[PDB]
Amino acid sequence: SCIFCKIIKGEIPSFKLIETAKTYSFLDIQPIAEAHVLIIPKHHGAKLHNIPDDYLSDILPVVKKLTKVLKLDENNTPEGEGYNVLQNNGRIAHQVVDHVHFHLIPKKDEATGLGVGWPAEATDFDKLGKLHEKLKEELAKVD
Amino acid sequence: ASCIFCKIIKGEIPSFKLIETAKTYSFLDIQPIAEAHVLIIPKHHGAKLHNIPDDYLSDILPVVKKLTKVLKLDENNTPEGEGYNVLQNNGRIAHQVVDHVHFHLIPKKDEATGLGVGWPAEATDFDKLGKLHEKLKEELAKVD
Ligand SMILES: [Zn+2]
Ligand SMILES: [Zn+2]
């Protein structure tokens, strides 16, 4: 039933851009900015951790090549127009289609493109230290 | 040389190190917007995504995937419950402050913390999409 798998299989049309042996990209037909692009692995998995590594390695090179296509790569200064790369995992994180997809979203002004809510907390070395200790312990056992 | 993220990689500025790779370096965000807000950076210094060599880009998302195992985010294989965002910002207007490419792995446990997504739908059309699609295809042919 997955609509992105249907896009890949040519059963739903799409404004196709770069296609790879592993990766498929196309214009978002519900964009939030002018050339809003989606980039998906051909391996169906709902979240990032469901994608094999060899599919994951292919995504950012394709995204970076798309920035050449959209000419976003002509601005090598922090000012002027910019862009975001965003991938969502779960309803609460704003994912609706349950197949991994990266958004390449040009940021031309404040009214359009991604709007970033950034609720940052103060630095607290004691809590970070305890969190680092716990995460390094989970890392040791992943290895 | 004047880049906090380069200095952090070299160990000249402190950091809470997590996974490191021949090509990638990751560590806790010390001004986090969610509990285990992690940063993931290529070791090569580029300001924007398009300034990073292909071989550094290929290694980033497998590291992010491995970090979702460290953070136990990989245990929820349903669209409900808690989630997470991967964000990368290019230029001041896109919310980028440090001019070394960094990816955010941000757990999404509730609505008050984590990434807040503003999503302003833009009125569009199959005519406009089609003409835009022809313009980008021409450019893709030149890139090739
Ligand atoms: Zn699918
Ligand atoms: Zn740097």
Swiss-Prot record, chain A:
Its cofactor is Mg(2+). Its EC number is 3.-.-.-. GO terms for molecular function: hydrolase activity; nucleotide binding. It comes from the Eukaryota. This is Adenosine 5'-monophosphoramidase HNT1. It catalyses: adenosine 5'-phosphoramidate + H2O = AMP + NH4(+). Homodimer. The active site is at H101. A motif (Histidine triad motif) lies at residues 99-103. Hydrolyzes adenosine 5'-monophosphoramidate substrates such as AMP-morpholidate, AMP-N-alanine methyl ester, AMP-alpha-acetyl lysine methyl ester and AMP-NH2. Residues 3-114 form the HIT domain. GO terms for biological process: nucleotide metabolic process. Keywords: Hydrolase, Magnesium, Nucleotide-binding. Induction: Expression is decreased at the stationary phase. Expression in suppressed in the presence of Pseudomonas aeruginosa lipopolysaccharide (LPS). Belongs to the HINT family. AMP binds at D28, I29, N88, H94, Q95, V96, H101, F102, H103.
